[PDB]
RNA sequence: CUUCUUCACGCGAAAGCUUGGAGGUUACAGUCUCAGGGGGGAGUACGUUCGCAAGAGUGAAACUUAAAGAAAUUGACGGA
RNA sequence: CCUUCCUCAAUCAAGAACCAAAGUGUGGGGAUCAAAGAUGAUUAGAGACCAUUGUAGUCCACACUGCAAACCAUGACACCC
RNA sequence: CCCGCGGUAAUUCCAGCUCCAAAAGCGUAUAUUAAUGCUGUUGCUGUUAAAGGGUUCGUAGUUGAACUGUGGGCCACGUA
């Protein structure tokens, strides 16, 4: 993280569950990284993705859709 | 092969000298399968590749105590990563070797720590955390730069191979049950990235598929 | 868990959350006094008045309608009940139950039910004494 | 039943984190609980809460985020004074450096680290990490 | 677009393929994206969401460098042709029928592919795959009906899938948009391709 | 080791502290009604042509039963069941899940 | 699940469903009504939960019965509400 | 067991598979065929293959027997995908301005900014 | 009262484990309480107290011993 | 139920009040089922299974008892999933 | 020590040799301390492995909820 002198010290500044943000570990095999390509008018611009890496559990929970659905609500795509 | 084609694209990309680091897997969230990927990625001299346990396995069965060997390889290198193997084989060595691959495969990132507070660098666990197993209990506790550490010989070797020196231990359980002990240990070792830190965390910025960042490249010399 | 019962009695009336009664009409303390007395003279147990009142008068929550609770008023107004009425209600049964029990042969229920109540009777009275309104040196028998 | 609602609240709270119930309206507060809730909130663990009225003991609506690792209550409460700060902390914080232990003070309901810093002993309530 | 709200023609299409009334009169309201217990084993499935999901599906579809590595699946007879028709067009990797695993559970079987993603359509029938997604950190978008379990399909496409044109239409319709994005198909296109060939099985 | 939870008795959750034992009509040691399976059935009479003989000789009509039939309230438990190739360890899970 | 909503605020579904002493705050579930005896041009305050009676006093008689829930209005007694 | 072994079945199959069509339903030429299109070992095995080849054809002769084909059908289907202009299963649809559900019309209306319509469910009915 | 679909991680050695399971605990800590604490000897002994009377209540050491147990697993086997 | 009443409680040694079977005393009680027994039969033995009965019991009045794989082998109370 | 050697081509017995370990100390005994959170405040147990009574009341015992504790105001500026 930072060491007695400050300073990052030690490897791998971890992932985090881009929904719950619970930490993402290293053996999550139901976690996924969506980079979702942004629209422009008529298209999409890409380079610009909203990007997430999200843990497995929710997938177990129906909140892989759903929670992300809120999350995605909090990031709106095509909406009313 | 000795010229193991790393048939994963990752192992490809990797073999193909892009992204050779564990962390890139861990970071990128990646899983593995292909053993050479690591074995490729990191292999600088001694790493601290090890066989640990050597067990007979039986299925009793009419005309047979069907005997097999289970063997444990721990793979590690002295800071941040360990790689676990148990494997069984009908030949002992084979079990080792089988375990070797599992050992390669079962690599984990180790968030180390100190104790009290930071010193020049960590060398401890960064937390007090626990591995439990059938009859096993250790909780591994933060110590500082000069500890002989509580508990078992057995993991200790590994710990060293993964890069930590001083952590406190409370071991509780059927040491009796050494196979499990290591399994517990590994598990413990796995929670070496557990706990919501208040200590870096902040926000993880995105990092996009380093694999699918070379998708086309991965689709070239490759379909 | 319930002190004579494995199951649960939630039941309940839900208190006037609104303490400011009642979205249609105020009354005076004189009225309430008037009422009370009229009823109390009519002889319900206060609780019983209260109940009764609640429908019958069709004016509600005694504590609200003058900022009180009946019993103290009554008390002050010299129309206290004789006793701690719940202990009574229990007693009146209990008594009855002894009588029934007296008729009976074998009924373990009347014993059970009696026990609990009598105990309860004790608790409550012990309680009244605890709140110094048992008459001192007092028991049920 | 049980007494220390604060305590019920912690186990329950914990569960709330754990599966991600991200708001709760707890039934039904005292003076006490709140001071404690505030500390955690001060310490970047949950979000913010809002106290609801009732005509009888309040309800509180609680904001959480995903930062609590564990929140305890200690029954019984215990004196605190010097060394005992060392021991408790050692006991319960995954490393001495993060987490808070809270005891109840003269100076108010308060964490131990700060307490260590305030140099006052008092009685021990619980902890969060 | 700008605007991504449904047209009466789109609407026409949708109701027509007959994708929009639920399964059982109530269903799993874990998928409570209905509102309306509807006679004879159905509900209204609120479309809005559906839509919102679909376009999203595209927003993420449009990320894939290799659209082939967007992997399609169909165990319903009623889905294969269609998936191809999307696939031919998209280049997807398709998965008809009985999956049979080892696929990315084994990298050592021929099968082996390693996409970013899989899209499932009969979650239910398609469990191995889900399981596969679950092995490898993969998410799976999916055509879900109202009791069509959604575990480990992330991003549900509320969708009655009773064969015929339902499935296929939906799929085709879906496509139209992704195509508007990556692919350049303009909107007041026909979008040439038709459910008629998205369709299914003959004769 | 233990093999079947309710162990026949269908009363743990509920309210039926202890319940009706019966001699089981086939062996006849006394037993509680829910550790015996029941399939109280009506029962058929005659073969085809003996019935045909009886049918022609059926100078018998209607009343809600146009030729009548038997009825056996059948209740089997270990004792008799066994021999009668009736009730035993199926495969696992059906030892917990009811008929349709 | 628990996202879009608020536990704190219910809305359009969401009050109707909470039950009595787990209405976010309990509140007298029953209520009072105004009732008229056709018996007279004069009328009465009533409990929608009564356990006893109303007498009309345009003629001493009772317009409802004690029964557990909502009390039984009867007889062409007309009521409105508050 | 006049079970055509796996190896057999595979072979009899395979010969039509690589060596499309031709044959007979007759064993005899199909026999000769077995000799001729493989480089097989024992006669028996060829004949057996043959017997089945006659067989498989004999029911292929009446179908695309369970699991089996010749690839044309497919290219008909391919050429039957093509029902487009002979079908509009679309705007067969009998109303552009629509006979439909309330709210659905309503979300649509708010979405269609105050546009004037009658908002009525599919029925009311479950 | 469910059953119990079905879900929950969780908990568990498993077997298995709901209402508000054996869950939410060595990340050990809501209260109250009973009990338990190798095995065997012995739950016994004139040990002792209820009890009409059974016998209950209460309740040992000597002596002895390396296990005893548990679940699963596979196997073997069955007058299955 | 908008009734009153203000912690009233909680759980709990001692201590009380219950506890199926069966037994046990004092009386019913008589039919049966059937411990005791008796008979067969069987057996290698067999007074055992098995049969055929059949005595006490059984039901009950009335007492008394305390032991019941007296099993949700799962103290209670709590708040959640 | 305890696991066990030993009926002869024994790895543990006999002797030899070699070796080893610790060492001028070392064997032993008995006890005692930890190991043992294997009596547990920390930190055990008690569904099948020890253990929650057949059942209830119940003084003793313990345990026991909220609430009137609180600060406030103002100013200054800087200041994210």
CSV table of N, CA, C and O in Angstrom, one decimal, chain B residues 11-49:
chain,number,residue,atom,x,y,z
B,11,UNK,N,-1.8,-17.6,-22.0
B,11,UNK,CA,-0.6,-18.3,-22.0
B,11,UNK,C,0.1,-18.1,-23.3
B,11,UNK,O,1.2,-17.9,-23.3
B,12,UNK,N,-0.7,-17.9,-24.3
B,12,UNK,CA,-0.2,-17.4,-25.5
B,12,UNK,C,0.4,-16.1,-25.3
B,12,UNK,O,1.6,-16.0,-25.3
B,13,UNK,N,-0.4,-15.1,-25.1
B,13,UNK,CA,-0.1,-13.7,-25.0
B,13,UNK,C,1.1,-13.5,-24.1
B,13,UNK,O,2.0,-12.7,-24.4
B,14,UNK,N,1.2,-14.3,-23.1
B,14,UNK,CA,2.1,-14.5,-22.0
B,14,UNK,C,3.4,-15.1,-22.5
B,14,UNK,O,4.4,-14.4,-22.5
B,15,UNK,N,3.3,-16.2,-23.1
B,15,UNK,CA,4.4,-16.9,-23.8
B,15,UNK,C,5.0,-16.0,-24.8
B,15,UNK,O,6.2,-15.9,-25.0
B,16,UNK,N,4.1,-15.2,-25.3
B,16,UNK,CA,4.3,-14.2,-26.3
B,16,UNK,C,4.5,-12.9,-25.7
B,16,UNK,O,4.2,-11.8,-26.2
B,17,UNK,N,5.1,-13.0,-24.6
B,17,UNK,CA,5.7,-11.9,-23.9
B,17,UNK,C,4.9,-10.6,-23.8
B,17,UNK,O,5.5,-9.5,-23.8
B,18,UNK,N,3.7,-10.7,-23.6
B,18,UNK,CA,2.9,-9.6,-23.3
B,18,UNK,C,2.3,-10.1,-22.1
B,18,UNK,O,1.8,-11.3,-22.0
B,19,UNK,N,2.2,-9.3,-21.1
B,19,UNK,CA,1.6,-9.5,-19.8
B,19,UNK,C,2.0,-10.6,-18.8
B,19,UNK,O,1.3,-11.2,-18.1
B,20,UNK,N,3.4,-10.9,-18.7
B,20,UNK,CA,3.9,-11.9,-17.8
B,20,UNK,C,3.9,-11.5,-16.4
B,20,UNK,O,4.9,-11.7,-15.7
B,21,UNK,N,2.7,-11.4,-15.8
B,21,UNK,CA,2.7,-11.3,-14.4
B,21,UNK,C,1.4,-11.7,-13.9
B,21,UNK,O,0.4,-11.6,-14.5
B,22,UNK,N,1.5,-12.3,-12.8
B,22,UNK,CA,0.5,-13.0,-12.1
B,22,UNK,C,-0.6,-12.2,-11.9
B,22,UNK,O,-1.8,-12.4,-12.0
B,23,UNK,N,-0.2,-11.0,-11.4
B,23,UNK,CA,-1.0,-9.9,-11.0
B,23,UNK,C,-1.7,-9.6,-12.1
B,23,UNK,O,-2.9,-9.2,-12.0
B,24,UNK,N,-1.2,-9.7,-13.3
B,24,UNK,CA,-2.1,-9.4,-14.4
B,24,UNK,C,-3.2,-10.3,-14.5
B,24,UNK,O,-4.3,-9.9,-14.7
B,25,UNK,N,-3.0,-11.6,-14.1
B,25,UNK,CA,-4.1,-12.4,-14.0
B,25,UNK,C,-5.0,-12.0,-12.9
B,25,UNK,O,-6.2,-12.0,-13.0
B,26,UNK,N,-4.4,-11.7,-11.8
B,26,UNK,CA,-5.2,-11.5,-10.6
B,26,UNK,C,-6.0,-10.2,-10.8
B,26,UNK,O,-7.2,-10.2,-10.7
B,27,UNK,N,-5.3,-9.3,-11.3
B,27,UNK,CA,-5.8,-8.0,-11.6
B,27,UNK,C,-6.8,-8.1,-12.6
B,27,UNK,O,-7.8,-7.5,-12.5
B,28,UNK,N,-6.6,-8.9,-13.6
B,28,UNK,CA,-7.4,-8.8,-14.7
B,28,UNK,C,-8.6,-9.7,-14.5
B,28,UNK,O,-9.5,-9.5,-15.2
B,29,UNK,N,-8.4,-10.5,-13.5
B,29,UNK,CA,-9.5,-11.3,-12.9
B,29,UNK,C,-9.5,-12.6,-13.4
B,29,UNK,O,-10.5,-13.3,-13.6
B,30,UNK,N,-8.4,-12.9,-14.0
B,30,UNK,CA,-8.3,-14.0,-14.8
B,30,UNK,C,-8.2,-15.3,-14.0
B,30,UNK,O,-7.7,-15.2,-12.9
B,31,UNK,N,-8.5,-16.4,-14.6
B,31,UNK,CA,-8.3,-17.7,-14.0
B,31,UNK,C,-7.2,-18.3,-14.9
B,31,UNK,O,-6.5,-17.5,-15.4
B,32,UNK,N,-6.9,-19.6,-14.9
B,32,UNK,CA,-5.8,-20.1,-15.6
B,32,UNK,C,-5.9,-21.4,-16.4
B,32,UNK,O,-6.0,-21.4,-17.6
B,33,UNK,N,-5.9,-22.6,-15.8
B,33,UNK,CA,-5.8,-23.9,-16.3
B,33,UNK,C,-4.5,-24.4,-16.8
B,33,UNK,O,-4.0,-25.5,-16.6
B,34,UNK,N,-3.9,-23.6,-17.7
B,34,UNK,CA,-2.7,-24.0,-18.3
B,34,UNK,C,-1.6,-23.8,-17.4
B,34,UNK,O,-1.5,-22.8,-16.8
B,35,UNK,N,-0.8,-24.8,-17.1
B,35,UNK,CA,0.1,-24.6,-16.0
B,35,UNK,C,1.3,-23.9,-16.4
B,35,UNK,O,1.9,-23.3,-15.6
B,36,UNK,N,1.6,-24.0,-17.6
B,36,UNK,CA,2.8,-23.4,-18.0
B,36,UNK,C,2.6,-21.9,-17.9
B,36,UNK,O,3.6,-21.3,-17.8
B,37,UNK,N,1.5,-21.4,-18.0
B,37,UNK,CA,1.4,-19.9,-17.9
B,37,UNK,C,2.2,-19.3,-16.9
B,37,UNK,O,2.8,-18.3,-17.1
B,38,UNK,N,2.2,-19.8,-15.7
B,38,UNK,CA,3.0,-19.2,-14.7
B,38,UNK,C,4.4,-19.5,-14.8
B,38,UNK,O,5.3,-18.8,-14.6
B,39,UNK,N,4.6,-20.8,-15.0
B,39,UNK,CA,5.8,-21.5,-15.1
B,39,UNK,C,6.6,-20.8,-16.1
B,39,UNK,O,7.8,-20.5,-15.9
B,40,UNK,N,6.0,-20.3,-17.1
B,40,UNK,CA,6.5,-19.4,-18.1
B,40,UNK,C,6.7,-18.1,-17.5
B,40,UNK,O,7.8,-17.5,-17.5
B,41,UNK,N,5.7,-17.5,-16.9
B,41,UNK,CA,5.7,-16.1,-16.5
B,41,UNK,C,6.7,-15.7,-15.5
B,41,UNK,O,7.2,-14.6,-15.6
B,42,UNK,N,6.9,-16.6,-14.6
B,42,UNK,CA,7.8,-16.4,-13.6
B,42,UNK,C,8.4,-17.7,-13.5
B,42,UNK,O,7.8,-18.8,-13.6
B,43,UNK,N,9.8,-17.7,-13.4
B,43,UNK,CA,10.6,-18.9,-13.3
B,43,UNK,C,12.0,-18.5,-13.0
B,43,UNK,O,12.8,-19.4,-12.9
B,44,UNK,N,12.3,-17.3,-12.8
B,44,UNK,CA,13.6,-16.8,-12.5
B,44,UNK,C,14.2,-17.5,-11.4
B,44,UNK,O,13.6,-17.6,-10.4
B,45,UNK,N,15.3,-18.2,-11.8
B,45,UNK,CA,16.1,-19.1,-11.0
B,45,UNK,C,15.2,-20.0,-10.1
B,45,UNK,O,14.1,-20.4,-10.5
B,46,UNK,N,15.7,-20.1,-8.9
B,46,UNK,CA,14.9,-20.6,-7.8
B,46,UNK,C,13.7,-19.8,-7.6
B,46,UNK,O,13.8,-18.6,-7.7
B,47,UNK,N,12.6,-20.4,-7.3
B,47,UNK,CA,11.5,-19.5,-7.0
B,47,UNK,C,11.1,-19.8,-5.7
B,47,UNK,O,10.9,-19.0,-4.8
B,48,UNK,N,10.9,-21.1,-5.5
B,48,UNK,CA,10.8,-21.8,-4.3
B,48,UNK,C,9.7,-22.7,-4.5
B,48,UNK,O,8.6,-22.6,-4.0
B,49,UNK,N,10.0,-23.5,-5.4
B,49,UNK,CA,9.3,-24.6,-5.9
B,49,UNK,C,9.6,-25.8,-5.1
B,49,UNK,O,10.8,-26.1,-4.8
